[PDB]
Design an enzyme around this catalytic site. Structure first.
Site, PDB file in Angstrom:
ATOM      1  CB  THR B   1      30.724  36.608  12.482  1.00  0.00           C
ATOM      2  OG1 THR B   1      30.288  35.441  12.505  1.00  0.00           O
ATOM      3  CG2 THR B   1      31.683  35.748  12.095  1.00  0.00           C
ATOM      4  CG  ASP B  17      34.844  38.630  12.778  1.00  0.00           C
ATOM      5  OD1 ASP B  17      34.470  37.647  12.251  1.00  0.00           O
ATOM      6  OD2 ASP B  17      34.286  38.966  13.550  1.00  0.00           O
ATOM      7  NE  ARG B  19      38.333  35.067  18.271  1.00  0.00           N
ATOM      8  CZ  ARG B  19      38.890  35.454  19.505  1.00  0.00           C
ATOM      9  NH1 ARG B  19      37.998  35.866  20.172  1.00  0.00           N
ATOM     10  NH2 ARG B  19      40.057  35.515  19.677  1.00  0.00           N
ATOM     11  CE  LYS B  33      34.185  33.541  10.366  1.00  0.00           C
ATOM     12  NZ  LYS B  33      33.936  32.085  10.561  1.00  0.00           N
ATOM     13  N   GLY B  47      26.036  33.653  10.825  1.00  0.00           N
ATOM     14  CA  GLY B  47      25.168  32.780  11.274  1.00  0.00           C
ATOM     15  C   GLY B  47      25.607  31.430  11.332  1.00  0.00           C
ATOM     16  CB  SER B 129      25.993  37.589  16.878  1.00  0.00           C
ATOM     17  OG  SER B 129      27.462  37.304  16.881  1.00  0.00           O
ATOM     18  CG  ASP B 166      29.606  39.848  18.781  1.00  0.00           C
ATOM     19  OD1 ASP B 166      30.363  38.789  18.954  1.00  0.00           O
ATOM     20  OD2 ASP B 166      28.720  39.565  18.253  1.00  0.00           O
ATOM     21  CB  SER B 169      33.268  40.420  16.013  1.00  0.00           C
ATOM     22  OG  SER B 169      32.947  40.960  14.752  1.00  0.00           O
TER      23      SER B 169
END
EC number: 3.4.25.1
Lengths: 241, 226, 242, 249, 244, 204, 231, 236
Positions: B1, B17, B19, B33, B47, B129, B166, B169
């Protein structure tokens, strides 16, 4: 029947123990007068210097809780120091755990809750001090909240404490009748001190010295006390008006 | 994420995001989220998913009391202090990587907070990330003092660079815009990029095309009277 | 009624038990403390009730940290217990902040403790007045602590029986010196008003003990005035009342 | 030692617990408060009184928020309400917003607060809070409900009720004025009228504190963009708004 | 004084009897009648509220009947406040036994447990006992339906029919003359109501002042189904017995 | 090994329209050894259905733990528990053991009885609400399931279309998993009746 | 009884009355006389039996090889203070490598008694100890009040008829202080002090217990025929 | 908390022990008679009131062990507390010492609960007296002990506690002997039935009998059995 000895209710719906706490604050004979200015809140209070062998600078009833919040205390000086210490401890706690200095409104409420718990213990006697908190917050403007040994507080346009405080209430009330607003408009903090002293002089029918007074002023984001020379300048200005 | 938080003159914008992953397997194609410390202090969590949600809920309760105890809007920095301390006793065993954003009467704020109780401030912060991917876009296009529309574009595009570089995400982009002296507008699914392409055939089966052994009825309404 | 404990309270705004405990201090030995410009000179009457006693071996003077003398009157065990508590407090301060504890700070800590026992029924009110002070970087200080848990700054203080003789002559002392006296001078003035306060204790006879903390004599450390200098003061005071 | 762990509540010899009778006396020395439940809202009302005329009553709260859709109001002692409302807020969050992640039902919350009272009649160093509370609320499971919390530590649901020293007068007034179907607007007009006969102060909206748990407000929710989520059912009326309703009696 | 204000109420009297336990039985005679009758096909619990008013909402009131578990409910006679603490301790204990043995708690054990808590208050702490009396309707498969009363001392007595609260003696004489050992739940429903009609606490018995609940084995497959009637279903049975 | 994947066990759940369905395998083993084919993972409290995967002792201890809690709720409010309040409860109880963590994946599947809305949620080891209204997967056939489930599923199924799709997805995953296989049970959960149907599956 | 059943009340006279009652335990008890010189301290205790079938009970407890205490009051109150003194004395040797100073042990003992007189449900201990020892500052003879107070003397007594013993010691005060280095003489003078503390109780050899401590002479309790040389 | 609920007396007594024994007096009546091959504890049962289901009503004799029985008099609340505690003691002798409990061990244990509350404060002794009887394992010696609420115990050959215990005691002076206890199970049982029919009277409805036979035999005699002994003794 022990409803005057421990903190249990009587058939009058009143806790006598708690009432007796208010009857100790009139025995030390400290009067205070507190008004909200336009950029300050000013509190002037008596300093009793009884002997020549007391050093008047260490005679205190103004404890500086936080950086911005003074507290004036009316009633016995043992209970005054215990209260001042507690109030400080909780304020530092609040800055530490919430990351900003404690507001005056919330400080009044925190001490009110512990005073109520001291009237709920029968082995911890409540502290017999009436506590006035003066500040200028930037979230409530100039503020006064007065807490009492029961655990009750309310906001104030102005307040007084002591035995002759009914006399003070009259003068202040008239002043807010004329302005028709709940604070004194005057942008100099110094002249709000001068007004405060005028209302005290009317009420008590006594003229004051610099060492009969002890003055605290909360301006925007700082609380300080006037030294004894500075108080005399204010009392010189009473005559200039 | 990836979580970006972009501060601007009139507020702060927090975007994320949707996902949600558990391993290389994608658990959810959509899941918000964005969590709520307060209705004016939205945060999003990156995380470890389980550690972010529970800790924002715990101090969400404590800040609600604080908000009732002061009778005003809570401050963003109050949330940050509760979080910092709680994480600190574990010494980083609990991995919360939040961007905490919010409005309050002293102005706009934007903080980031790490698992040990480390804290940083800035006018844009990015965590998780995909953070690296977002940050590059941000530093070109960002200027001091954005408008609300400007900031919404910038945040949403930063997550988008998150989506092509990434894999933590992906899917839709949510935005929640918090401005000073107004309500917060949760503009859920502000951008939808990647929607599923239509299947070649419909997988429908007539009755008895899988095997059954025996059936029965089992009623779960209530204990039944006669 | 209204003395059965200290969570009783009267409609008089007084606590009776605590006022009664001040009478124990009135039954104590005479003790004085003179606040000087550069220090404090304490003196305490030590009665000779018998020639069986051993002179200047029973101290009523216990030092706290290194620069705060504490001397008391009233119930001797209760005051030694008070000073034991405050020696732990002095150590904690030195631990945490790596500096000797100031005089205003030491006063505050003692005051909370004595103040606490006049609220609890599980712990008995104090019956001591302590006179304590010293020299730190914020000046010389002198403090008198009631068993009610009150203190103030003082230019002169006394407690005990013979405070009647002592207190009066401190009004003349301020009137001698409205800008105080030397630490040197106060040796012979602390001795002098124990000898005048020996007229409320003239049933018996006494031994003079003297101690000081001053910047200009000992360097702001509390030491005992001993030898020829203690005896010089005793010779001075002895002549005044004769 | 501190051997206070023995209860300060004790049975009386003609039955009944003496301590809570004494606390019930403290309710009848306090202000007056009332609640009328409508079929499309609840109105709660109380009277404001001050210790000084220099005390502000615009910073004085006797109606407090426990959760957004649920309000409380007291009669009795100020101090006793002040700590206990904080404990009511606390137990809604520790035991249903850290376990069920949402604001508790009105039925549920009222029960939990009676447990708190119940342990203030048990053990030494405690004595019951000498207030009765009205807990008006709305939940999504039992509808509107109006409750009265006793210093006994018991609760009862009501349709309209009063507490305070002028309670008997107020409920007899409300006896004729309650109907099976009510409007919220009519409920407000009855509430101010009933409290006119039990208030010896001014009857301006400055000194009459009015709050509704009427219809929800999604513009006080503090965010927008989830239609699904609903805002505060509570709405405190400021002084000018209360004056408009005084002319509309 | 931390013993000067203690009176000692966890002591026996010269008789061998606890002061506070004796007084509690008085304060429970204040609360209204509560009845348990054990038929064979179930247990009828019927209680008349101890408060009524017309602006009181009695359609959602729970002040007598409470479920401890799906086969065990209690009627309360005493203070609501006092009983509540025990009711939630009961819920925890019943479910604890279900959690560890994967079997519902027999009626015996639960009754014994609450009794221990009441005795525990007089045994130590200087605490007063909660003055509650419960009438337990319970099912287990080992003794079938079991009926019990517990008193504020913490003791339990098996029964076939029993009453606590107001007009305890009157109610009991009515049960003794009218009881059969071959009574149905139907017979016991009519007996319960007619007994409450002579021990009524206004001058008329009304459906909205009654809580009425049964536990019936009529419910299929051998299950026991507790049904707590609505006042509008209690009304139906009030017309059956022709009070109305 | 990992104490979650030592006994395996798998749960599939899919939404439909006016229905939900949850299903599990009956295989419960210890490591390589198959222990039982007589072990169901689906439990229900009211109209909420709980499936639980992962470590065996934690399957059964959490089954009785959630039973403890829902009894308290039910007696208190005197109503059935909702799928949404059950999620919150599951999330909080898993987070209690953060250290020495639980080693399971609970799965929440029910139908909101105040709107008629199908509702599902997922959880893993110490917590995490997995909001989806499509499907939630767990266990050592998760790879097998997520792929299978995504392709077959179309939104707004009927109770009987839902039955054919969920049966297939389970059958092929379980037989391309080693720690699943022995037998299957499928609950088709409507607003008013729940049919429990066993599947004949190849013994693996 | 107004304040006499309580240990936490004052007392309009500035006392606690419990302390005076704790003092009467010394009057009903045994008598012991202490006297010291610069180089020696001496305790001569009068041991007491209950009847003739009864042997006499030791009234001197050895605390160390340089320390001893004696009880004149109630024995179970003495049993609390004696353990505490022994523990803090071994502790001084253990931690600080120090023979426990007699003066300082008196101050720790003072505050201990105090905090049970402060506490409700406590008492001031009704035992007076005379505590001797020879430490680095020479000989000491302390007086322990029930309150806690310690006073240092060349000669004192507690018990019944103690007043007459102190009259004797004030007379011979400068005699026994100026015999130094002869333990024999101090003991003999303490026998004559406690002879003025008899009411026909008589001194025999199994009544009489002496203990001394010297510059170089350990704390040793003599009985039997080791006290028969001093009669 | 430790605020004495047990405190010393000016007679050298303790107040709560004097009150406890009177609380045992006003309670039910227990008779204990031991033969050479049995023990019998028969006790008074309060089931006077009708509509009481006597079957599910608590018993006056509770087995603690498979050959150790306990009966009680005094408060009915307190006795059940002891009976839970004794059950723990029973499993603890098995736990650490193996073998089921000896009678003598269990007698010291009940008394040790009483003892605790006797010396300490914040507690008061239960107003409970017991007759403990049974066999030790591999013994066919009857043991008959008595505990009292003081924390004291006494061995007996026969004992009776409760109401009009003196009437029953005197009756057993003229029937029972220490020298030669009844040599039969039934003779013992009938002597205890005869004593109870004096004061308790009122059939097998208020009268109970429990018999323990040597080495792990507990048997209970139903109402019908008790009634048959009653009629024969009445006639004789």
């Amino acid at each position: 029947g022990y409803d005057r000895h421990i903190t249990i209710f009587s058939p009058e719906g009143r806790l006598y123990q708690v009432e007796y706490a208010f009857k100790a604050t009139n025995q030390t004979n400290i009067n205070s007068l507190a008004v909200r200015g336009k950029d300050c809140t000013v509190v002037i209070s008596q300093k009793k210097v009884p002997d020549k062998l007391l050093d008047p600078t260490t005679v205190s009833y103004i404890f500086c809780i936080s950086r911005t919040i003074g507290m004036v205390v009316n009633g016995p000086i043992p209970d005054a120091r215990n209260a001042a210490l507690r109030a400080k401890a909780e304020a530092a706690e609040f800055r530490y755990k919430y990351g900003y200095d404690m507001p005056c409104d919330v400080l009044a409420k925190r001490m009110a809750n512990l005073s109520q718990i001291y009237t709920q213990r029968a082995y911890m006697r409540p502290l017999g001090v009436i506590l006035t908190f003066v500040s200028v917050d930037e979230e409530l403007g100039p503020s006064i909240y007065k807490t009492d040994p029961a655990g009750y507080y309310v906001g104030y346009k102005a307040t007084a404490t002591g035995p002759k405080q009914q006399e003070i209430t009259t003068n202040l009330e008239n002043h807010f009748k004329k302005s028709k607003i709940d604070h004194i408009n005057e942008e100099s903090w110094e002249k709000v001190v001068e007004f405060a002293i005028t209302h005290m002089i009317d009420a008590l029918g006594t003229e004051f010295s610099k060492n009969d007074l002890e003055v605290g002023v909360a301006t925007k984001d700082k609380f300080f006390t006037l030294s004894a020379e500075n108080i005399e300048e204010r009392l010189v200005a009473i005559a200039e008006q | 994420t990836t979580i970006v938080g972009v501060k601007f003159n009139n507020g702060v914008v927090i975007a994320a995001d949707t996902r949600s992953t558990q391993g290389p397997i994608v658990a959810d194609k959509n899941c918000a989220k964005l969590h709520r410390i307060s209705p004016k202090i939205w945060c999003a969590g990156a995380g470890t998913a389980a550690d972010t949600e529970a800790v924002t809920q715990l101090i969400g309760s404590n800040i609600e009391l604080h908000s009732l105890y002061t009778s005003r809007e809570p401050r963003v920095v109050s949330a940050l202090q509760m979080l910092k301390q709680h994480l600190f006793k574990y010494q980083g065993h609990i991995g919360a990587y939040l961007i905490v954003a919010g409005v309050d009467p002293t102005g706009s704020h934007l903080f980031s907070i790490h698992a040990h109780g480390s804290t940083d401030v800035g006018y844009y912060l990015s965590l998780g990330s995909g953070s690296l991917a977002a940050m590059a876009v941000l530093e070109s296009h960002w200027k001091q003092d954005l408008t609300k529309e400007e900031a919404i574009k910038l945040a949403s595009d930063a997550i988008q660079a998150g989506i092509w570089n990434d894999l933590g995400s992906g899917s839709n982009v949510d935005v929640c815009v918090m401005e000073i002296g107004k309500d917060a507008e949760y503009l859920r699914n502000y951008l939808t990029p990647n929607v599923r392409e239509e299947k070649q055939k419909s997988y429908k089966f007539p009755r008895g095309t899988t095997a059954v052994l025996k059936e029965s009825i089992v009623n779960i309404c209530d204990i039944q009277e006669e | 009624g209204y003395d059965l404990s200290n969570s009783v309270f009267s409609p008089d705004g007084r606590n009776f038990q605590v006022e009664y405990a001040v009478k124990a201090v009135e039954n104590g030995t005479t003790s004085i403390g003179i606040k000087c410009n550069d220090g404090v000179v304490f003196a305490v009457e030590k009665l000779i009730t018998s020639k069986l006693l051993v002179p200047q071996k029973n101290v009523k003077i216990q030092v706290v940290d290194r620069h705060i003398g504490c001397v008391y009157s009233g119930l001797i065990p209760d005051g030694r217990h008070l000073v034991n508590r405050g020696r732990e407090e002095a150590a904690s301060f030195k631990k945490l902040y790596k500096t000797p504890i100031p005089i205003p700070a030491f006063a505050d800590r003692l005051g909370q403790y004595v103040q606490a026992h006049t609220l609890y029924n599980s712990v008995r009110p104090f019956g001591v007045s302590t006179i304590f002070g010293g020299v730190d970087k914020n000046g010389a200080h002198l403090y008198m602590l009631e068993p009610s848990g009150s203190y103030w700054g003082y230019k002169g203080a006394a407690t005990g029986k013979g405070r009647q003789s002592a207190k009066a002559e401190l009004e003349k002392l301020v009137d001698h010196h409205p800008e105080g006296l030397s630490a040197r001078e106060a040796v012979k003035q602390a001795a002098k008003i124990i000898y005048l306060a020996h007229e409320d204790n003239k049933e018996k006879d006494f031994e003079l003990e003297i101690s000081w903390c001053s910047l200009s004599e000992t360097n702001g450390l509390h030491k005992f005035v001993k030898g020829d200098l203690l005896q010089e003061a005793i010779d001075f005071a002895q002549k005044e009342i004769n | 030692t501190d051997r206070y762990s023995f209860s300060l509540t004790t049975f009386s010899p003609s039955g009944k617990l003496g301590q809570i009778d004494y606390a019930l006396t403290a309710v009848k020395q306090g202000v007056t408060s009332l609640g009328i439940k409508a079929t499309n809202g609840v109105v709660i009302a109380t009277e404001k009184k001050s210790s000084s005329p220099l005390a502000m009553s615009e910073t004085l709260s006797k109606v407090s928020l426990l959760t957004p859709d649920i309000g409380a109001v007291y009669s009795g002692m100020g101090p006793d309400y002040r700590v206990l409302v904080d404990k009511s807020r606390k137990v809604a969050h520790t035991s249903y917003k850290r376990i069920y992640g949402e604001y508790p039902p009105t039925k549920l919350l009222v029960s939990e607060v009676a447990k708190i009272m119940q342990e203030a009649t048990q053990s030494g160093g405690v004595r019951p809070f000498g207030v009765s509370l009205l807990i008006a609320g709305h939940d999504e499971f039992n509808g509107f409900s109006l409750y009265q919390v006793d210093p006994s530590g018991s609760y009862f649901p009501w349709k309209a009720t009063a507490i305070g020293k002028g309670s008997v007068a107020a409920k007899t007034f409300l006896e004729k004025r309650w109907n099976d179907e009510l409007e919220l607007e009519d409920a407000i007009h009855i509430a101010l009228l009933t409290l006119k006969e039990s208030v010896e102060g001014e009857f301006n909206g400055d000194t009459i504190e009015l709050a509704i748990i009427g219809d929800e407000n999604p513009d006080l929710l503090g965010y927008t963009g989830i239609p699904t989520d609903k805002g505060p059912r509570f709405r405190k009326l400021t002084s000018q708004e209360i004056n408009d309703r005084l002319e509309a009696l | 004084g931390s013993r000067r204000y203690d009176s000692r109420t966890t002591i026996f009297s010269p008789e061998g009897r606890l002061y506070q336990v004796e007084y509690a039985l008085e304060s429970i005679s204040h609360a209204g009648t509560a009845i348990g009758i054990m038929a064979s096909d179930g247990i009828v619990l019927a209680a008349e509220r101890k408060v009524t008013s017309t602006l009181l909402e009695q359609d959602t009131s729970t002040e007598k009947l409470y479920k401890l578990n799906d086969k065990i409910a209690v009627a309360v006679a005493g203070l609501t406040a006092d009983a509540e603490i025990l009711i939630n301790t009961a819920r925890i204990h019943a479910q604890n036994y279900l959690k560890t043995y994967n079997e519902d708690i027999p009626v015996e054990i639960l009754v014994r447990r609450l009794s221990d808590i009441k005795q525990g208050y007089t045994q130590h702490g200087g605490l007063r006992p909660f003055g509650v009396s419960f009438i337990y309707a319970g099912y287990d498969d080992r003794y079938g339906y079991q009926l019990y009363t517990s008193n504020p001392s913490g003791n339990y007595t098996g029964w076939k029919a029993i009453s606590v609260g107001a007009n305890t003696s009157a109610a009991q004489t009515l049960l003794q003359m009218d009881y059969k050992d071959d009574m149905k739940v139907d017979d016991a429903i009519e007996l319960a109501l007619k007994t409450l009609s002579k021990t009524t606490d206004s001058s008329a018995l009304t459906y909205d002042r009654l809580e009425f609940a049964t536990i019936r084995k009529g419910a299929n497959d051998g299950e026991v189904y507790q049904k707590i009637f609505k006042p509008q279903e209690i009304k139906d049975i009030l017309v059956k017995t022709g009070i109305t | 090994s990992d104490p979650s994947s030592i006994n395996g066990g798998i749960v599939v759940a899919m939404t439909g329209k006016d229905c939900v369905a949850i299903a599990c395998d009956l295989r419960l083993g210890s490591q390589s050894l198959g222990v039982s084919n007589k072990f169901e993972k689906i439990f229900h409290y009211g109209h909420v259905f709980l499936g639980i995967t992962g470590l065996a002792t934690d399957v059964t201890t959490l089954n009785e733990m959630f039973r403890y809690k829902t009894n308290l709720y039910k007696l208190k409010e005197e109503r059935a528990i909702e799928p949404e309040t059950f999620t919150q409860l599951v999330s909080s109880s898993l987070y209690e053991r953060r250290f020495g963590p639980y080693f399971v994946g609970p799965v929440v599947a029910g139908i909101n009885s105040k709107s008629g809305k199908p509702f599902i949620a997922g959880f893993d080891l110490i917590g995490c609400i997995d909001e989806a209204k499509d499907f939630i997967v767990s266990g050592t056939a998760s790879d097998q399931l997520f792929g299978m489930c995504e392709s077959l599923y179309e939104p707004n199924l009927e109770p009987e279309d839902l039955f054919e799709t969920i049966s297939q997805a389970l059958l092929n995953a379980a037989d391309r998993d080693a720690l699943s296989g022995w037998g299957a049970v499928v609950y088709i959960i409507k607003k008013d009746e729940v049919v429990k149907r066993y599947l004949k599956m190849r013994q693996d | 009884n107004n304040y006499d059943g309580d240990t936490v009340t004052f007392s309009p006279t500035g006392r606690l009355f419990q302390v005076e009652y704790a003092l009467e335990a010394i009057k009903q008890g045994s008598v012991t006389v202490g006297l010291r010189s610069n180089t020696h301290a001496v305790l001569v205790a009068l041991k007491r039996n209950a009847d003739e079938l009864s042997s006499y009970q030791k009234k001197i407890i050895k605390c160390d090889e340089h320390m001893g205490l004696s009880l004149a009051g109630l024995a179970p109150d003495a049993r609390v203070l004696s353990n505490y003194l022994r523990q803090q004395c071994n502790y001084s040797s253990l931690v600080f490598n120090r023979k426990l100073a007699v003066e300082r042990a008196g101050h720790l003992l003072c505050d201990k008694a105090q905090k049970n007189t402060q506490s409700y449900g406590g008492r001031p201990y009704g035992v007076g100890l005379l505590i001797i020892g020879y430490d680095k500052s020479g000989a000491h003879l302390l007086e322990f009040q029930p309150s806690g107070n310690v006073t240092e003397l060349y000669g004192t007594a507690i018990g019944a008829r103690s007043q007459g013993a102190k009259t004797y010691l004030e007379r011979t005060l400068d005699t026994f202080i100026k015999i130094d280095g002869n333990p024999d003489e101090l003991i003999k003078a303490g026998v004559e002090a406690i002879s003025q503390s008899l009411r026909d109780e008589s001194l025999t050899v199994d009544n009489l217990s002496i203990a001394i401590v010297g510059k170089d002479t350990p704390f040793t309790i003599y009985d039997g025929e080791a006290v028969a040389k001093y009669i | 908390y430790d605020r004495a609920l047990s405190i010393f007396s000016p007679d050298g007594h303790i107040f709560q022990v004097e009150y406890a024994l009177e609380a045992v007096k006003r309670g039910t009546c227990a008779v204990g008679v031991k033969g050479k091959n049995c023990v019998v504890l028969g006790c008074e049962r309060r089931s006077t009131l009708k509509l009481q289901d006597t079957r599910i009503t608590p018993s006056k004799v509770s087995k603690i062990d498979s050959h150790v029985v306990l009966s009680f008099s005094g408060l009915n609340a307190d006795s059940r507390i002891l009976i839970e505690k004794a059950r723990v003691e029973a499993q603890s002798h098995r736990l650490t010492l193996e073998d089921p409990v000896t009678v003598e061990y269990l007698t010291r244990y009940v008394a040790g609960v009483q003892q605790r509350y006797t010396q300490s404060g914040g507690v008061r002794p239960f107003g409970v007296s017991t007759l403990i009887a049974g066999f030790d394992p591999r013994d066919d010696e009857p043991k008959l002990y008595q505990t009292e609420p003081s924390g004291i115990y006494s061995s007996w050959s026969a004992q009776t506690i409760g109401r009009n215990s003196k009437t029953v005691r005197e009756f057993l002076e003229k029937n029972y002997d220490r020298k030669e206890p009844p040599a039969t199970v039934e003779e013992c049982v009938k002597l205890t039935v005869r004593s109870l029919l004096e004061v308790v009277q009122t059939g097998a409805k208020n009268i109970e009998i429990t018999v323990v036979k040597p080495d792990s035999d507990i048997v209970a005699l139903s109402s019908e059995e008790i009634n048959q002994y009653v009629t024969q003794i009445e006639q004789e």
